[PDB]
């Protein structure tokens, strides 16, 4: 597995078991299930009131509010209309699934529930290719705080959309690492020459955010890509929303998936050593 | 001339006089073997071998009978322990499993010297020792110092003796002088 | 603690000492030969009256000086010739000086000595390397 | 903080996952991976867990746990990656992970773990759990005790062996195991013999499949077997079932009756020598003998607290028939003691309970659960600056205070 | 003559009186007493006591005693009654390691060097039926680890970690009476240091006195065998080597020496009197018609030595120091070689020896 | 653990150190006559199906010899049991096959020699090999009403799948 | 190099001259059998320490005794990438210096990896085999370090490559 996968399994699995189960005509049992997702997002499954006919799925992002003055609740009733339903206190987000009432296709409705945190980090995306495509220049830029400490900043111009990613290395090393891999990003466009153009800097933001209070430091690296039409028109949009939000994981994994090849590559070549060292003695 | 025994149970530091012995100068310590087979328990657990305090008390004893010593400047074995593997050794238990001991071979009898180490209150086998001497006849110091003898089967550690002997210095020269007036300082432990 | 913290050892008669006592060779002679092209002949002198007996580190680094700064100043094929012209005495010599340099590396000063040991080392064989090992008296 | 502890519990057979809190994992899946067989690339990121690895047809499926033990560090590490970043989908820098090991893993196994963990994922905290110790705490849900304990015997039965493990304090008594060569797989295959001596139309390329099956959905613990047989061959009606199932070739129905096998299966466990030459010591003589080996002062708080844990333990009466068992033999021994010369009677207590199947993860959970496991667990900062011998010791908690 | 006795290493051994048996220690707290059966080797007896590794053994000739020194501090004596040899403990008054022990040529007392920076000089007293010691200590200053006897059995040689190769008179009246002058000295008293090299570098692993006792050689760990010549006002012949430390050291002529260590193969050095010289002449490990069937080559480690690890100690075996013509080398590796002066001189035509 | 029997009696009489247990029959032999309403035989036939599987038997009594015997021979039935199409024809096959002489306790080819004492003399011979084919007779005609379902030519799946198993790994047939 | 095989041929030499060792039992402390480079209670076992350059950067430092020697590397990192790298791999070892008996469980201060090397080594194992390994493990991790390296940067472009070219 290259690329991170964008839908919740455990969303889907849940939900799958729950609807073949009611479909079936079996009574329903309780479900109670707390998770998480990347980026400090929680989950509740539960049926609320203890109706165990009832099944609600629950987000609580520590940063909904700031989605939500670029366009979250609107979207998300789009996608998910009579489902969505007032909130659970400690979350953002609430699906509820009536198992005495299912459509026809109960397998797209399990799709779209796995895509829940996909779908509300969507909307700021839409928002600043619209004003793209529509050519309304100058908007103030998104500022979104998808970790305590990392940031992520998107700003439509004229030809473009940029989003920049301020993200933290804690361990020092993988600065050295990720800046291999930021350098391959860099240089993308020698594959692939319609993809979008990636910037990096190291331990300091790109100028225009200079004046603000962007973090500065040893274990910060801010990461830019240039979304360019053919990226951010109705076509592509959802794909290409789709790989960005993915993205300060996707690089973070593969710092890791690399730690452990290395790790394999230290197995074989201290086991070689111990060999050698053993061929010195005379024998037992 | 004061004896150290030290048996499975308890220690004690016996002065006697052209004769016999005196049970005013007559100290015990509250640590001996059993003790120091107690405490190697503690320090395999910390290094991951959970014996069972009853059930492998015999299996332990054995390892420390074997593998402990007793360490002559801590500072160094310390160094020795934390910065090379030359103090491992391996230990077959008796289900054939075999285990590596290193560090706990001069932690486990440190207690001797360091009675807190296992909760106990107290000065330690040499400053016991010292004290014994140091409080008794000023015209048998000299002739008790240079006469001291270890007996018991908590006594055979390694380097004992001479721990024993480097502990009094540091005594002698702290609570009894203050510049270098060694040489003269003799005293043998055999 | 505290009375543990002072190290009786350094008192114990009965311990090791070594025997001491209390200059170097001519810089100006050394210069003389270099500034002439008598690499070999500034070799030798380099070697002479070496300060295996003084207490001060800025004598022994001195002499050091003048050594190394004739090993540099030696092109590399007439090393083996200028090796070859001197005593076990002086081969001995020369290998500990040659050890000292290791400790001073500057530009390519260690490609040249590992030449030097190369040729040291063929004319006074691994007994020339152990005599760096346990001299008490050295460079 | 807002997020809950991984909890994972790798098995030689299957690997338990989930989020502690939770009484359930969220996932179980069969401890293999799937590879492709000079690695260059991304070579190393080609490969599938669990059921997605089984039957693959480019791909070679591996077994990396072996015995309980990690035999294939490489693999492991890699499995771990997909456990993480594919099914938890967790940022392991944002979570503490509790991990299990069987008694007998040793200090440098616990060290490899470590350095997989906090300098390949980045994890903040650590604890290694022993599966036994958490199977124990998992029985503190039973109806059948009032106070936490962590000293009692552990019966672990899966498919591969059966574990009887005593605990005293939360520290396994480890020189005084003993294994058993009769679990899951054993039932399955007496079940096939009876079933192919009696019963025909069954294919070949099938036996397994139906043997499975019966055992999963008939099968039982009875208190007597001449009895049995003989209410078997007296109301047949409402004690022979039938099964029905399809063949993969030909997609035509082939329907077998159900007898004997149903309480003949596990009853291999009492009677080990029915299928199996080389042993014949009963569950409840191994039990006993465990016992009789541990500490005097602690053989009776074993007696009074013998936990089950696994798949194969899940036997209607499995835990009466052991419990009864077990009183007959020590009840007998103690007569004879009496007629030789008034021995206390010893009780004899086989707890079973709802979480049995995987009572390891849910013990694991319940105790990560809690502000404890916090501040037992070995933090990054201690394994940076203290190295990785910390993860040599993780200390038992969850019951004093 | 190669035999492998195991692959751990021969620590210390000595020959009994007709060379019919060798007693060595392998790497243990034993010492393993063999004799040839045939061309075959095998093990006769198990001498036990030791708790801790032997480092020294000695065979009294005449008497038939063995001595045996170890790391526990003990010595002890032993004793053939029947079949079986039995221990009696000699206390050595030390607090370290014992290193070394040689029995006197008079064998009525015998020597220890230890890590207590001293030598402790053994004898029995027929009075009170006990071993008693006194002590030569001043001025050692480190470890002893080599011994060897002067022939009027007074005079001692020893070589320590302090760098130094020295000679005491070890004269004990009680045992043996006012011993005839010697070029070494008039004046020969209990613990009299008679001689002390000038050298303060490398450890002194062997020291071996002359046949006539005129003349003492020894091998420092800074790759040097040197020789001093009491005819010649103790005058000191060095000689520096092209290759590594020595550990055992042995005339076989009044001007001839053998010895071996770290490079694993016996060497020869000639001693020119005249010139007061020593002088390199060997390398004497050098790789009738059944010698010639024997020697042809076949159809087609990595040491081109017999031993395969370093030789610590070098024993003569027949002919005496004054003209060996068969000496002994054991060694890390567990082997012991048989070496035969002529056959060397024969296959080596430009051999010296003297 | 398997089956024993609970019929020996202080005054149960032995043949060989097998117990001369009494059986209901009209077989001739020296088998006492049964007044209870069971006896050795039906034991035998009631532990059958689950003493079979037992690959281990400590002989607590002289009466465990005897049930043993029965055991076996239920399984020599079963062998012939196996092939066969009718009750009526089945109950030939045993008259005939309680007839043919099966070895006895000192003869090669009987299993557990040394378990069971052979007989001493020539009358003790005559007598225990009339008591053995007393107790096949009967074994054997008992057991047919027990195979057959009262639906003709049905030796039981449910009595012939122990056709293979050998109690105690043992065979009269061997 | 063309500075490499003068410099492993200094190093070996001086590894011979160094491995020249026997039992010592200790002379400080009664029945003790110590490293006498380690604790180095007793100066006149001790040899003068000596060190091979290579440049400025890579050096072996050889310091031996009677009994021991202990040898420290300095090894090649010219970027940050191999310094991780080396410092990763060293640790890496350390860590199992048990398992690799002549190894130190900490570097010499100023070093990457460091040996002791004890009469016990010599005895059962032939010195000459251990010069060697010395030598072929120098050769070895520069090696290894230089592969470590191609393959993070191979699988990085991959990476980048694949997100890239799904948009």
């Known amino acids: 597995m290259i690329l991170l996968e964008v839908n919740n399994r455990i969303i889907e699995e849940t939900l799958a078991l729950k609807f073949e189960n009611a479909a079936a005509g079996n009574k329903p049992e309780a479900v109670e299930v707390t998770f998480a997702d990347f980026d400090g997002v929680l989950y509740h499954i539960s049926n609320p009131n203890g109706d165990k006919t009832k099944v609600m799925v629950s987000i609580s992002l520590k940063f909904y509010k700031e989605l939500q003055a670029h366009g979250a609740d609107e979207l998300l009733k789009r996608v998910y209309g009579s489902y969505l339903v007032n909130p659970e206190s400690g979350y953002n987000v609430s699906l509820l699934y009536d198992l005495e009432n299912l459509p026809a296709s109960k397998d797209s409705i399990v799709h779209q529930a796995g895509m829940l945190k996909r779908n509300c980090f969507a909307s700021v995306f839409e928002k600043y290719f619209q004003f793209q495509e529509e050519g309304k220049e100058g908007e103030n830029r998104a500022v979104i705080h998808y970790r305590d400490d990392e940031t992520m900043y998107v700003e439509s111009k004229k030809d473009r959309v940029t989003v920049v990613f301020s993200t933290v290395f804690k361990d020092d090393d993988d600065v050295v690492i990720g800046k291999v891999f930021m350098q391959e990003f860099k240089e993308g466009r020698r594959a692939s020459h319609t993809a979008p153009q990636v910037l990096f800097s190291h331990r300091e933001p790109p100028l225009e955010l200079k004046d603000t209070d962007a973090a500065v430091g040893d274990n910060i690296g801010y990461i830019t890509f240039v979304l360019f039409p053919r990226h951010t028109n109705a076509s592509a949009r959802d794909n290409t929303i789709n790989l960005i939000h993915t993205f300060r994981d996707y690089l973070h994994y593969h710092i890791k998936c690399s730690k452990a090849y290395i790790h394999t590559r230290m197995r074989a070549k201290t086991s070689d050593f111990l060999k050698v060292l053993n061929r010195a003695r005379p024998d037992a | 001339g004061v004896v150290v025994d030290s048996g499975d149970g308890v220690t004690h530091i016996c002065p006697v006089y052209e004769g016999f012995s005196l049970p005013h100068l007559t100290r015990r310590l509250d640590i001996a073997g059993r003790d120091i087979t107690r405490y190697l328990i503690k320090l395999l657990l910390l290094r991951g071998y959970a014996f069972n305090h009853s059930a492998d008390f015999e299996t332990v004893r054995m390892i420390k009978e074997k593998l402990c010593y007793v360490g002559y400047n801590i500072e160094q074995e310390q160094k020795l322990a934390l910065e090379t593997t030359v103090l491992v050794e391996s230990y077959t238990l008796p289900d054939g499993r075999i285990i590596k001991v290193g560090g706990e071979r001069f932690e486990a009898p440190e207690a001797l010297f360091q009675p807190h180490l296992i909760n106990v209150e107290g000065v330690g086998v040499a400053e016991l020792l010292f004290n014994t001497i140091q409080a008794a006849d000023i015209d048998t110091r000299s002739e008790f110092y240079k006469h001291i003898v270890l007996s018991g089967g908590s006594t055979m550690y390694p380097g004992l003796p001479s721990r024993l002997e480097r502990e009094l210095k540091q005594l002698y020269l702290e609570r009894v002088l203050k510049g270098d007036v060694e040489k003269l300082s003799k005293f043998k432990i055999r | 603690a505290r009375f543990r913290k002072v190290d009786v050892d350094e008192y114990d008669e009965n311990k090791f000492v070594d025997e001491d006592d209390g200059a170097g060779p001519d810089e100006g002679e050394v210069d003389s030969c270099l500034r002439q092209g008598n690499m070999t002949a500034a070799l030798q002198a380099a070697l002479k009256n070496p300060p295996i007996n003084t207490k001060s580190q800025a004598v022994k680094d001195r002499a050091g000086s003048i050594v190394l700064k004739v090993l540099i100043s030696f092109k590399a094929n007439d090393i083996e010739k200028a090796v070859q012209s001197l005593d076990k005495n002086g081969v001995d010599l020369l290998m500990k000086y040659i050890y000292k340099g290791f400790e001073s590396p500057s530009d390519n000063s260690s490609a040249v000595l590992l030449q030097w040991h190369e040729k040291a080392l063929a004319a006074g064989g691994v007994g020339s390397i152990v005599r760096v090992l346990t001299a008490r008296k050295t460079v | 903080g807002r997020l809950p502890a991984c909890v994972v519990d790798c098995g030689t057979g299957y690997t338990k996952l989930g989020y502690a809190g939770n009484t359930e994992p969220q996932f179980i899946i069969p401890s293999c991976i799937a590879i492709k067989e000079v690695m260059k690339g991304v070579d190393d990121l080609d490969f599938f867990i669990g059921d997605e690895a089984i039957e693959k047809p480019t791909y070679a499926t591996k077994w990396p746990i072996r015995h309980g033990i990690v035999e294939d560090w490489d693999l492991m590490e890699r499995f771990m990656e997909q456990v993480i970043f594919k099914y938890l989908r967790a940022e392991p820098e944002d979570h503490y992970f509790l991990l299990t090991e069987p008694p007998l893993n040793t200090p440098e196994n616990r060290e490899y773990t470590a350095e997989i963990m906090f300098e390949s994922f980045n994890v903040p905290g650590l604890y290694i759990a022993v599966q036994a110790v958490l199977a124990l705490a998992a029985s503190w849900t039973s109806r059948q005790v009032g106070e936490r304990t962590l000293t009692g015997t552990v019966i672990d039965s899966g498919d591969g062996v059966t574990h009887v493990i005593p605990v005293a304090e939360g520290y396994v008594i480890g020189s005084c195991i003993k294994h058993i060569p009769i679990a899951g797989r054993d039932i399955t295959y007496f079940i096939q013999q009876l079933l192919r001596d009696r019963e025909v139309g069954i294919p070949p390329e099938q036996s397994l499949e139906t043997a499975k099956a019966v055992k999963e959905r008939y099968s039982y613990v009875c208190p007597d077997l001449v009895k049995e047989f003989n209410k078997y061959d007296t109301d047949g009606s409402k004690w022979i079932k039938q099964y029905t199932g399809i063949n993969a070739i030909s997609k035509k129905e082939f329907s077998i009756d159900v007898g004997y096998e149903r309480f003949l299966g596990p009853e291999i466990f009492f009677h080990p020598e029915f299928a199996n030459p080389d042993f014949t010591q009963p569950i409840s003589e191994v039990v006993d003998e465990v016992i009789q080996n541990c500490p005097i002062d602690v053989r009776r708080p074993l007696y009074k607290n013998i936990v089950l844990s696994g798949g194969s333990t899940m036997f209607r009466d499995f835990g009466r028939r052991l419990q009864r068992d077990l009183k007959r033999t020590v009840d007998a021994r103690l007569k004879l003691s009496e007629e030789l010369s008034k021995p206390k009677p010893i009780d004899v207590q086989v707890i079973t309970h709802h979480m049995q199947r995987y009572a390891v993860w849910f013990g694991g959970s319940m105790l990560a659960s809690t502000p404890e496991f916090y501040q037992v667990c070995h933090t990054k900062k201690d394994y940076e600056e203290i190295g990785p011998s910390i993860c040599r010791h993780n200390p038992v908690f969850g019951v004093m205070s | 003559a190669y035999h492998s006795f195991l692959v751990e290493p021969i620590s210390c051994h000595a020959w009994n009186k007709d060379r019919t048996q060798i007693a060595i220690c392998p790497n243990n ?286 024993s003569v075996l027949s002919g005496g120091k004054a003209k060996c013509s068969q000496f002994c080398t054991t060694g890390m590796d567990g082997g012991m070689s048989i070496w035969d002066v002529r056959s060397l001189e024969s296959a080596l035509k430009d051999l010296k020896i003297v | 653990p398997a089956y024993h029997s609970s019929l020996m009696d202080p005054d149960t009489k032995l043949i060989g150190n097998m117990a001369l247990l009494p059986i209901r029959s009209q077989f001739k032999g020296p088998a006492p006559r049964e007044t209870k309403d069971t006896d050795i035989v039906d034991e035998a036939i009631y532990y059958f199906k689950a003493n079979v599987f037992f690959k281990n038997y400590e002989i607590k009594n002289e009466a465990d010899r005897t049930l043993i015997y029965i055991t076996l021979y239920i399984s020599e039935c079963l062998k012939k049991l196996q092939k066969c199409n009718s009750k009526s024809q089945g109950e030939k096959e045993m008259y005939t096959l309680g007839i043919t002489n099966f070895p006895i306790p000192g003869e090669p080819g009987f299993p557990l020699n040394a378990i069971y004492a052979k007989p001493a003399n020539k009358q003790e011979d005559e007598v225990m090999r009339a008591y053995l084919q007393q107790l096949r007779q009967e074994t054997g005609l008992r057991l047919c009403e027990k195979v057959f379902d009262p639906q003709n030519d049905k030796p039981s799946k449910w009595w012939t799948c122990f056709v293979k198993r050998q109690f105690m790994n043992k065979s009269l047939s061997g | 190099t063309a500075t490499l095989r003068p410099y492993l041929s200094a190093v070996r030499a001086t590894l011979q001259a160094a491995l020249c060792l026997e039992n010592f039992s200790s002379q400080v402390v009664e029945r003790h059998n110590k490293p006498e480079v380690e604790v180095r209670s007793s100066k006149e076992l001790l040899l003068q320490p000596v060190t091979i350059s290579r440049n400025e950067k890579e050096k072996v430092l050889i310091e031996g005794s009677i009994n021991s020697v202990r040898v420290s590397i300095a090894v090649k990192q010219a970027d940050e990438i191999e310094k991780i790298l080396c410092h990763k791999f060293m640790r890496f070892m350390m860590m199992r210096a048990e398992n690799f008996f002549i190894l130190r469980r900490k570097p010499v201060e100023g070093y990457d990896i460091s040996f002791l090397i004890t009469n016990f080594h010599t005895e059962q194992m032939y010195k000459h085999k251990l010069v060697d390994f010395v030598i072929h493990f120098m050769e070895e991790i520069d090696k290894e370090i230089s592969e470590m390296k191609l393959s993070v940067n191979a699988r990085a472009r991959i990476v980048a490559e694949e997100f890239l070219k799904n948009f």
């Open chain 5, 29 to 314: 707290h034993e010492v393993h007493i063999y004799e040839k059966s045939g061309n075959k080797w095998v093990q006769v007896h198990e001498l036990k006591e030791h708790n801790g590794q032997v480092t020294g053994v000695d065979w009294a000739p005449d008497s038939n005693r063995i001595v045996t020194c170890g790391t526990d501090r003990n010595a002890y004596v032993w004793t053939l009654k029947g079949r079986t040899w039995k221990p009696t403990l000699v206390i050595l008054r030390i607090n370290r390691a014992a290193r070394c022990v040689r029995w006197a040529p008079n064998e009525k007392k015998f020597a220890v060097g230890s890590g207590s920076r001293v030598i402790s000089i053994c004898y029995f007293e027929q009075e009170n039926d006990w071993w008693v010691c006194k002590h030569i200590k001043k001025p050692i200053r480190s470890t002893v680890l080599s011994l060897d006897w002067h022939p009027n059995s007074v005079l001692l040689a020893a070589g320590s970690c302090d760098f130094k190769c020295r000679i005491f008179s070890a004269y004990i009246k009680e045992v043996e009476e006012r011993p005839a002058p010697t070029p070494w000295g008039s004046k020969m008293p209990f613990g009299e240091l008679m001689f002390e090299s000038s050298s303060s570098c490398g450890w002194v692993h062997g020291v071996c006195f002359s046949a006539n006792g005129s003349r003492v050689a020894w091998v420092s760990h800074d790759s040097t065998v040197c020789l001093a010549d009491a005819d010649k006002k103790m005058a000191v012949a060095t000689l520096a080597s092209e290759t590594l430390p020595l550990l055992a050291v042995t005339f076989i002529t009044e001007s001839s020496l053998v010895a071996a260590g770290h490079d694993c193969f016996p060497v020869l050095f000639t001693y020119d009197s005249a010139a007061g010289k020593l002088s390199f002449g060997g390398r004497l490990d050098v790789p009738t018609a059944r010698e010639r069937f024997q020697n042809l080559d076949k159809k087609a480690a990595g040491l081109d030595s017999l031993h395969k690890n370093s030789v610590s100690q070098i």
